[PDB]
Each structure stands twice: as C-alpha cells, then as structure tokens.
Amino acid sequence: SQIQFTRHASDVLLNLNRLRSRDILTDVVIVVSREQFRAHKTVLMACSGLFYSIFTDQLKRNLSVINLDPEINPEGFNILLDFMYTSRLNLREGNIMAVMATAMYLQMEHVVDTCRKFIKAS
Amino acid sequence: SQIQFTRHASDVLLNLNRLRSRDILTDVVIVVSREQFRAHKTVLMACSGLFYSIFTDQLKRNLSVINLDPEINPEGFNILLDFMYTSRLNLREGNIMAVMATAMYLQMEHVVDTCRKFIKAS
Ligand SMILES: Cc1cc(C)n(-c2ncc(Cl)c(Nc3ccc4c(c3)CC(=O)N4)n2)n1
Ligand SMILES: Cc1cc(C)n(-c2ncc(Cl)c(Nc3ccc4c(c3)CC(=O)N4)n2)n1
Numbered sequence: 370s371q372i373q374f375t376r377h378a379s380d381v382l383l384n385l386n387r388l389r390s391r392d393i394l395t396d397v398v399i400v401v402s403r404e405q406f407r408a409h410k411t412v413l414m415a416c417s418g419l420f421y422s423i424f425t426d427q428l429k430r431n432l433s434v435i436n437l438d439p440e441i442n443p444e445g446f447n448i449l450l451d452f453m454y455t456s457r458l459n460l461r462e463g464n465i466m467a468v469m470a471t472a473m474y475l476q477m478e479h480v481v482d483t484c485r486k487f488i489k490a491s
Numbered sequence: 492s493q494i495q496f497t498r499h500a501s502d503v504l505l506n507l508n509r510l511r512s513r514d515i516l517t518d519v520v521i522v523v524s525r526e527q528f529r530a531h532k533t534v535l536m537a538c539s540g541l542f543y544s545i546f547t548d549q550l551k552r553n554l555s556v557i558n559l560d561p562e563i564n565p566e567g568f569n570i571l572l573d574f575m576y577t578s579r580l581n582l583r584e585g586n587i588m589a590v591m592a593t594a595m596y597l598q599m600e601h602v603v604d605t606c607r608k609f610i611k612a613s
Contacts, residue, residue: 371580378501379500385533410516411515415510456496459494479499
C-alpha cells in the first residue's frame, strides 16, 4: 500500500502561512469592523463552517471582500485566523470569551469544544 | 503558551482535497502531454520547488495553464498530485522510476529522498 508522510500536512500548512505572510495568491479580505485581514478562501473554507457555507455557494464564490458581523471582536478573529494557518491556538483568561464567541460565529466546532474544555479546566 | 491541535494540518489538507475533487477555487490546469490536471496553485507551491519558483515570480503568478515538459509521464504526475493533497505516496516497482523522475523535475526533495530509500530497501 501507500507510504505515509507524517509531517507533510504540517509542512503544507507552514508553506501556506508563508504565502499568506507575503500576500501570495490571497484572494479575499475579511473586514472585522476597523480591521482588515487578507487570506486564502480555500484555507478559510477548510477551517470554518461559515466560510465553507459562503464560498461553496456559486453566488458568493467569487467575492473579494467579506464584511463580518460588526459585533465580532477583531482580536478574536485575528487569533483564529492565525490558528487556521498554524494549528496553534492562543487561549488566555483575557481572550477566552472573545475567542469562543468568534469560533461559534465562524462555526469552528473543534475550537468551540476546546474553549469549553479551557473553561472546564479553569 | 499556545494549544497545539495535532490533527488540524491533516484536517485542512483533507478539506483542500475535497475542494479539489469538487473543482472549488482551483485556479490552474497542469497539462502533462495528453492529460490535464486541475489544482490550487497555493498547494502546488507548498509541495514543489518548481511550482514555487513559477508562481512566486510576478510574471507567471497569474497563469491559468502550465504546460509541463512533454517527457513527463502523466501517471507519475498524477501519483505526485494525489501525494500533495493526501500525504500518501503510492510507490511500486512498476512506477518507482517514473515517480522519482517526476519528483526530481518537480523539485520535491523529500519525495526524491523517499524514492532513493525505496530503491535502497528493494
Ligand atoms: C464530506 C464533507 C462534508 C463537509 C462539510 N466537507 C467539507 N468539505 C470541504 C471543506 Cl473546505 C469543508 N469545510 C468545513 C465545513 C464545515 C466545518 C468545517 C470545515 C469546520 C467546522 O467546524 N465545520 N468541509 N466534506
Ligand atoms: C523560508 C522559506 C524558504 C522557502 C523556499 N520557503 C517557502 N515558502 C513558501 C512556499 Cl509555498 C515554499 N514552497 C516550496 C519551495 C521549495 C521546495 C518546496 C516547497 C518543496 C521542495 O522540495 N522544495 N517555500 N520559505
């Protein structure tokens, strides 16, 4: 059968984060109140139920700008976008509520579950 | 410090392969003689020294069609494209030479090294 490369997926994600850092082939800007964040739609869809539901629809597939809900905390979004590209989630007592509320809105079930475990273990 | 999600990178790659299977946001067609393969440029760049060198150049960044070297075996390319999206490499005695020659051309150093180990262990 097939040879499994145990570090390939992480190596791919690291290189996709390098492309995001250099703004290479980013195709969308996410507006979160006064802040803006560029990303790859494919990565957003891969991590979020919300972005999946948006860009999978042929009507919204080619949008270059997504205006998020004005109540969404930009810091919460920033932390989650970095999570999407790194597999690392920066949860603190100062940000737990903002991050969890953002993850619920973005429909990132695994992150929501982790936020629940963080509260439980606090 | 940050919470590490050990399965996140693999979950992202699986979802990117699902998008490729549905032709969602694929932005390039790779022509390999009589065969054609659609892909996401970001994933190709993330896995291959060749595609990285091509699309990182502003002159070639927006190409929608890449005509590979006519001597490249389409089966070899097909196997490697599936590798890029799955972390699984299908090496057999019948394909080892074709896969290794393709990986060398695509500048996929880790795959070339694995092909060398396959020959060594044969
Ligand atoms: C069989 C099958 C079913 C689905 C929904 N697939 C799927 N394909 C492709 C992508 Cl990009 C994707 N994204 C995605 C959707 C929803 C959610 C997340 C990511 C994280 C989360 O919490 N919810 N999901 N594949
Ligand atoms: C610091 C630093 C240096 C580089 C070259 N970085 C980098 N950033 C982004 C991408 Cl997409 C990328 N791809 C890539 C390039 C070459 C090769 C492979 C993938 C596989 C292989 O065998 N060779 N490489 N980052």
